[PDB]
Amino acid sequence: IVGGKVCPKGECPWQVLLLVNGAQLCGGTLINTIWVVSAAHCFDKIKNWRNLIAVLGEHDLSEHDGDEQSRRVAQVIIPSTYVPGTTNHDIALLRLHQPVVLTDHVVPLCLPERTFSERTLAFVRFSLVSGWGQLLDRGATALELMVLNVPRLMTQDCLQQSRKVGDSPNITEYMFCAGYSDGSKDSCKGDSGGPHATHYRGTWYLTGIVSWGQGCATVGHFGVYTRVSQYIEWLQKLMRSEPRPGVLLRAPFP
Amino acid sequence: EPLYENSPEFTPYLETNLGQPTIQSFEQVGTKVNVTVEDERTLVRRNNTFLSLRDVFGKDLIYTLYYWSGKKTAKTNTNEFLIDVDKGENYCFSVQAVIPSRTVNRKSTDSPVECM
Amino acid sequence: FLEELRPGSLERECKEEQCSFEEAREIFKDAERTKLFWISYSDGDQCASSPCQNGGSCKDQLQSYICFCLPAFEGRNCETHKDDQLICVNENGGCEQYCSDHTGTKRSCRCHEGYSLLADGVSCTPTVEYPCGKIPILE
Amino acid sequence: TVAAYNLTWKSTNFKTILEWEPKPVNQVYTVQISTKSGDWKSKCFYTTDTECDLTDEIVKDVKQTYLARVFSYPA
Numbered sequence: 394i395v396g397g398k399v400c401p402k403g404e405c406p407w408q409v410l411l412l413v414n415g416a417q418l419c420g421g422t423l424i425n426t427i428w429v430v431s432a433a434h435c436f437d438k439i440k441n442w443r444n445l446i447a448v449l450g451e452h453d454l455s456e457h458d459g460d461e462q463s464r465r466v467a468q469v470i471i472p473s474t475y476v477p478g479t480t481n482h483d484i485a486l487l488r489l490h491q492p493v494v495l496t497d498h499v500v501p502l503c504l505p506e507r508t509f510s511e512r513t514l515a516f517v518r519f520s521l522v523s524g525w526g527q528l529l530d531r532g533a534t535a536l537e538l539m540v541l542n543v544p545r546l547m548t549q550d551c552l553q554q555s556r557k558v559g560d561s562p563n564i565t566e567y568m569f570c571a572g573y574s575d576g577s578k579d580s581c582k583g584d585s586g587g588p589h590a591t592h593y594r595g596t597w598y599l600t601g602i603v604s605w606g607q608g609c610a611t612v613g614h615f616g617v618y619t620r621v622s623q624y625i626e627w628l629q630k631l632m633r634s635e636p637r638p639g640v641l642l643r644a645p646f647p
Numbered sequence: 648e649p650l651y652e653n654s655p656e657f658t659p660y661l662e663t664n665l666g667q668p669t670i671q672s673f674e675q676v677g678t679k680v681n682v683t684v685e686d687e688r689t690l691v692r693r694n695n696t697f698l699s700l701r702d703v704f705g706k707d708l709i710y711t712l713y714y715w716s717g718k719k720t721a722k723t724n725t726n727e728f729l730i731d732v733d734k735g736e737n738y739c740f741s742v743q744a745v746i747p748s749r750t751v752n753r754k755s756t757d758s759p760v761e762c763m
Numbered sequence: 764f765l766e767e768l769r770p771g772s773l774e775r776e777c778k779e780e781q782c783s784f785e786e787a788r789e790i791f792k793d794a795e796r797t798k799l800f801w802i803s804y805s806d807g808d809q810c811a812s813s814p815c816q817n818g819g820s821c822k823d824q825l826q827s828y829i830c831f832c833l834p835a836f837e838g839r840n841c842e843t844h845k846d847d848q849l850i851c852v853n854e855n856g857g858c859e860q861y862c863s864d865h866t867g868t869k870r871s872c873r874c875h876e877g878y879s880l881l882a883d884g885v886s887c888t889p890t891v892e893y894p895c896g897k898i899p900i901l902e
Numbered sequence: 903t904v905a906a907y908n909l910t911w912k913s914t915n916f917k918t919i920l921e922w923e924p925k926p927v928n929q930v931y932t933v934q935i936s937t938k939s940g941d942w943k944s945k946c947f948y949t950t951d952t953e954c955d956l957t958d959e960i961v962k963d964v965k966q967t968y969l970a971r972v973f974s975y976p977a
């Protein structure tokens with residue numbers, strides 16, 4: 394996260410830390426006691442699918458306290474339409490081997506209904522994005538969870554307000570831009586998979602997933618997030634699916 | 648997302664047009680004339696009641712009087728003018744709402760003309 | 764023609780009766796003042812047709828008017844009934860969480876799992892200790 | 903669908919109406935208005951009119967700067 398603030402311990406309770414063989418990999422969002430939503434591109438180079446751990450109640454990566462809960466990732470589901478190395482359909486649904494226990498420090502973010510998300514949440518200007526990612530594009534990562542308030546843009550505006558770049562990825566219907574183009578604030582590498590959470594009439598909902606951008610907080614550019622509303626049905630169905638043998642599962646989409 | 652178009656930015660206080668005023672009355676008082684401008688009602692509400700242009704703009708709003716061979720002008724921080732006139736002579740009046748601090752759209756259209 | 768013996772009079776010629784430009788000009792004896800008078804005099808009262816609906820008030824302007832509406836109405840001519848705008852696209856239909864439109868009748872409100880719709884038909888309250896989307900340490 | 907154009911603000915004594923073109927043919931409009939940092943509020947839902955009274959929204963704070971947008975939806 395570039396230009397954000399430390400999320401006071403316990404105030405970003407749905408934030409998930411994903412580890413691969415004990416090393417920091419990506420972020421994620423808890424939506425219930427056993428399912429976590431993350432980004433598909435976070436698993437492009439995974440080889441040891443059996444060494445995937447999800448940590449809840451985490452805050453300071455340098456100290457362990459009694460609020461932290463760890464669970465093995467039993468399954469990783471990604472849209473078969475996703476193409477490693479690219480940006481479209483950047484979403485992953487993770488099934489934990491054992492459910493976490495909800496506490497004052499571990500709470501799931503609400504996965505909203507599609508229409509509610511498209512007609513109402515999409516028009517709340519600001520939302521929170523968070524993670525232990527890089528504090529500057531090529532800089533160091535954060536030890537304490539960081540959070541940032543970013544304003545959302547309809548894609549037409551995003552395109553008209555962004556500096557034209559040669560081989561830049563298209564902003565599809567499965568994405569949306571949020572942030573600032575003045576080079577001051579943005580999500581960044583490592584934050585990938587984390588939540589873009591929207592507050593509406595007293596409750597917080599999952600509206601986006603930290604996905605990509607052109608260099609963190611680069612002038613003339615906004616951060617790009619996976620448009621979760623397009624995957625509500627897809628996610629709900631899969632969460633009712635039966636456990637497969639292998640870890641990785643490329644499920645059909647729609 | 649649907650196709651759409653953005654409008655220009657709009658700041659009400661600085662851009663809404665000032666309505667055409669109406670001279671409420673003009674009474675001769677000795678060697679002077681008291682010209683009163685009717686309170687211009689606006690769409691801004693406040694407890695089942697509409698605020699006047701005066702209530703909204705306060706000191707930013709003034710009214711200008713055009714009366715009369717050349718013409719003379721008078722200005723007021725309220726909604727009333729008290730001008731010196733020559734007895735036996737007939738005068739005509741017209742008023743205009745003005746927000747001097749503006750650079751564009753600073754004045755309303757002139758009110759209907761009223762003569763003695 | 765016996766009326767035309769009475770000396771010029773703005774009051775009798777233009778205020779009581781209707782007068783022409785030159786008639787008015789012959790009174791003001793000056794293009795500038797005459798036109799200033801004419802601008803409004805010949806403009807007409809756009810409020811004549813009573814454009815403001817649902818009990819609104821009309822205020823004439825130059826070649827236009829303004830409608831002041833009662834609290835429950837809006838629109839150029841107060842034609843919009845605020846009471847008929849209770850639909851999900853309008854501020855979520857007043858629903859705290861989910862909104863469902865129902866053509867023919869009225870919209871209903873619903874809640875996310877872990878919550879239950881209250882009596883008011885629009886608010887939602889937790890049915891579990893840790894409902895989704897709430898921050899315990901701040902609650 | 904065709905995007906609206908020539909969006910113009912018509913405002914006198916705060917009675918504020920947004921106007922635009924073109925008259926619709928097999929499409930309807932919905933307008934949204936907001937302040938630079940506030941949420942978008944919808945008005946004139948699925949209208950075939952080419953105007954939208956926004957008075958009630960702008961009088962909430964006449965000193966704020968508002969931006970409106972007109973959406974086109976296929977009928």
Ligand SMILES: CC(C)CNC(=O)c1ccc(Oc2nc(Oc3cccc(C(=N)N)c3)c(F)c(N(C(C)C)C(C)C)c2F)c(C(=O)O)c1
Nearest residue numbers: 417478479480580581582583585604605606608609616617
């Ligand atoms: C220890 C950890 C913090 C590891 N961090 C690292 O060193 C690290 C190195 C590289 C890396 O890959 C990577 N990082 C990107 O930056 C990001 C990722 C997420 C958000 C933004 C933003 N500006 N809001 C930028 C990418 F936009 C892409 N693309 C893809 C295709 C979406 C572009 C479009 C090519 C990408 F692959 C990540 C990551 O994915 O988070 C992390």
Ligand SMILES: *[C@@H]1O[C@H](CO)[C@@H](O)[C@H](O)[C@H]1NC(C)=O
Nearest residue numbers: 672676681682683727728729
């Ligand atoms: C002028 O007329 C107004 C309107 O009645 C009145 O309130 C005010 O006291 C008068 N002042 C003068 C100059 O006599």
Ligand SMILES: OC[C@H]1O[C@H](O)[C@H](O)[C@@H](O)[C@@H]1O
Nearest residue numbers: 808809810811812813814828
């Ligand atoms: O009834 C609608 C009409 O009312 C009045 O005639 C107005 O002058 C006119 O502008 C409006 O179109």
Ligand SMILES: C[C@@H]1O[C@@H](O)[C@@H](O)[C@H](O)[C@@H]1O
Nearest residue numbers: 818819820821831832833
């Ligand atoms: C807003 C309207 O204003 C005038 O038209 C009054 O005569 C009406 O009763 C109404 O209050």
Ligand SMILES: [Ca+2]
Nearest residue numbers: 453454456457
């Ligand atoms: Ca820790």
Ligand SMILES: [Ca+2]
Nearest residue numbers: 776782783786
């Ligand atoms: Ca005559």
Ligand SMILES: [Ca+2]
Nearest residue numbers: 774775778779
């Ligand atoms: Ca008479």
Ligand SMILES: [Ca+2]
Nearest residue numbers: 785786788789
């Ligand atoms: Ca003549």
Ligand SMILES: [Ca+2]
Nearest residue numbers: 806807824826
């Ligand atoms: Ca008129």
